Design a protein around this motif. Structure first.
Motif, mmCIF file in Angstrom:
data_model
loop_
_atom_site.group_PDB
_atom_site.id
_atom_site.type_symbol
_atom_site.label_atom_id
_atom_site.label_comp_id
_atom_site.label_asym_id
_atom_site.label_seq_id
_atom_site.Cartn_x
_atom_site.Cartn_y
_atom_site.Cartn_z
ATOM 1 N N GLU A 115 3.566 -42.194 -23.857
ATOM 2 C CA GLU A 115 5.008 -42.456 -23.882
ATOM 3 C C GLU A 115 5.261 -41.214 -23.702
ATOM 4 O O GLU A 115 6.772 -41.250 -23.173
ATOM 5 N N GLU A 116 6.043 -40.430 -24.659
ATOM 6 C CA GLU A 116 6.912 -39.527 -25.147
ATOM 7 C C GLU A 116 7.792 -40.562 -25.774
ATOM 8 O O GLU A 116 8.300 -40.009 -26.940
ATOM 9 N N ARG A 117 8.671 -40.791 -24.530
ATOM 10 C CA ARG A 117 10.254 -41.161 -24.433
ATOM 11 C C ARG A 117 10.123 -43.185 -23.920
ATOM 12 O O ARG A 117 8.955 -43.249 -24.274
ATOM 13 N N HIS A 118 11.047 -43.595 -23.992
ATOM 14 C CA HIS A 118 11.237 -44.650 -23.730
ATOM 15 C C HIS A 118 11.314 -45.315 -22.280
ATOM 16 O O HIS A 118 11.719 -45.545 -22.039
ATOM 17 N N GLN A 119 12.517 -44.277 -21.770
ATOM 18 C CA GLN A 119 13.005 -44.510 -19.905
ATOM 19 C C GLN A 119 11.769 -44.392 -19.226
ATOM 20 O O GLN A 119 11.657 -45.136 -18.548
ATOM 21 N N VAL A 120 11.018 -43.716 -19.314
ATOM 22 C CA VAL A 120 9.389 -43.864 -18.659
ATOM 23 C C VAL A 120 8.779 -45.603 -18.504
ATOM 24 O O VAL A 120 8.628 -46.005 -18.506
ATOM 25 N N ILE A 121 8.513 -45.871 -20.212
ATOM 26 C CA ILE A 121 8.861 -46.937 -20.402
ATOM 27 C C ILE A 121 9.494 -48.444 -19.065
ATOM 28 O O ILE A 121 8.938 -49.209 -19.346
ATOM 29 N N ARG A 122 10.937 -47.833 -19.717
ATOM 30 C CA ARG A 122 11.533 -49.307 -18.354
ATOM 31 C C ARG A 122 11.047 -48.714 -17.101
ATOM 32 O O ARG A 122 11.053 -49.886 -16.324
ATOM 33 N N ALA A 123 11.098 -47.510 -16.079
ATOM 34 C CA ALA A 123 10.304 -47.326 -15.361
ATOM 35 C C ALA A 123 8.861 -48.029 -14.414
ATOM 36 O O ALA A 123 8.501 -48.982 -13.821
ATOM 37 N N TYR A 124 8.337 -48.059 -15.709
ATOM 38 C CA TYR A 124 6.903 -49.108 -15.355
ATOM 39 C C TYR A 124 7.277 -50.115 -15.321
ATOM 40 O O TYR A 124 6.562 -50.884 -14.543
#
Length: 80
Positions: free
Chosen positions: A39-48
């Motif tokens: 996870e690390e960040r929140h933007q990656v979650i947004r993309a997924y």
């Protein structure tokens, strides 16, 4: 070791109980194992989520919560 604070999930909880567009998000993500990956960040979650879910409400709810947990956080480290 597993490090799951489930911050984002804690925010969306409460909506998952009555038939709400926001609750559908929590319900559908609660379907998955929720086992930590990278996870690390929140933007990656947004993309997924935006790549899998085409539903406007599911996308909107996610980037809204992410936006808040950034702007609200920063403006609580710096608030007038």
């Amino acid at each position: 070791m597993a490090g799951d604070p489930m911050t984002f999930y804690n925010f969306i909880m409460g909506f998952q109980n009555d038939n709400t567009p926001f609750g559908i998000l929590a319900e559908h993500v609660s379907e998955d194992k929720a086992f930590p990956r990278l996870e690390e960040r929140h933007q990656v979650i947004r993309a997924y989520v935006m790549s899998n879910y085409t539903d406007h409400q599911l996308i909107e709810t996610t980037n809204r919560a992410i936006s808040l947990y950034m702007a609200n956080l920063e403006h609580h480290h710096h608030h007038h």
